[PDB]
């Protein structure tokens, strides 16, 4: 026998979408071919993102996209997000944007198009830039979710600022002993 350990042999990663959506699987076929037959690493990143789950494909807001596309040298580049583009009602001026997204909210789409912008699907992006040249690959905030407030060190340990799980918030719900020096301790 050989002296090796087999507990890390199988790498845990998406090799395909768990989704049964046929349009998603079709453009997965398209970008699988593109990744295999081109040297571009953009295609590989896009394919692995297409495999991902919804929590790993967070929505990207219009404001965040505009802010990332306003950076110097990104003029006339295509903003590519593997996910949904969301309207942000906190912004008032929408510039002319060339955009490729898996999904676009109806209000975001109307705002982008009335601002003179252009919206593409991923097959159109493959026909436009097959190697992903002239693109800005964006992503929504991956940790912008409520669960990440509860993740981390336990709430009852020193120097932890993680939210606890409480059915209600109020002065009677997890505020006395272990939360203030007057009631035992605080940490």
């Amino acid at each position: 026998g050989v002296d090796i350990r087999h507990n890390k042999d199988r790498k845990v990663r998406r090799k395909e979408p768990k989704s049964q959506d046929i349009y998603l699987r079709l453009l997965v076929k398209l970008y699988r071919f593109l990744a295999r037959r081109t040297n571009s690493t953009f295609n590989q990143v896009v394919l692995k993102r297409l495999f991902m789950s919804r929590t790993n494909r967070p929505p990207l807001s219009l404001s965040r996209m505009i802010r990332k596309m306003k950076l110097p040298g990104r003029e006339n580049k295509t903003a590519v997000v593997v996910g949904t583009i969301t309207d942000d009602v906190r912004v008032q001026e929408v510039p002319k944007l060339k955009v490729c997204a898996l999904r676009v909210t109806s209000r975001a789409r109307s705002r982008i198009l009335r601002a003179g912008g252009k919206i593409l699907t991923f097959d159109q992006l493959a026909l436009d830039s097959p190697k992903g040249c002239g693109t800005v690959l964006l992503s929504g905030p991956r940790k912008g979710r409520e669960v990440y407030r509860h993740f981390g060190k336990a709430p009852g340990t020193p120097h932890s600022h993680t939210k606890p799980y409480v059915r209600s918030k109020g002065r009677k719900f997890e505020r006395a002993r272990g939360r203030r020096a007057s009631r035992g301790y605080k940490n």
């Binding site: 009602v89 906190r90 008032q92 336990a154 709430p155 009852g156 340990t157 606890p164 799980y165 409480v166 002065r171 009677k172 997890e174 505020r175 006395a176 002993r177 272990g178 939360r179 203030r180 009631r183 035992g184 940490n187």
Partner: protein, 147 residues
Amino acid sequence: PSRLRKTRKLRGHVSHGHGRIGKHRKHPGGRGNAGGLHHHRINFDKYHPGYFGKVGMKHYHLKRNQSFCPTVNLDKLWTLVSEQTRVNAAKNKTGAAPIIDVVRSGYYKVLGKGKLPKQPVIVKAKFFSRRAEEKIKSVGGACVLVA
């Protein structure tokens, strides 16, 4: 669908996934939140600090309607009116500023998170914050109060 569950896979395995040594007994450790200060103290202190004890003043017959006061921020303030209102105000030659009545839209207090566009505007609200009023005045607007 019961055909997708672990019980279908656990047929033939004698302990049904609960171990041979410790088994699956009725209630080892108590029922519910039993022993939260005695033998589940570590769990309660670790994950629910503040669980035990009283804090603050009690108040009988709380009527939540009395304290009902929804709030809106200045970054969402212009979404209470139509797009036409803001566009006409922006392109208006005169000093006429539109009125946004947040009470009509269902808010009582105007908070001052975010920035405003550079357009004068008259805001009607029950309550204002200091910074919201300052930011409204800095764009040439006015804050009026309603009851």
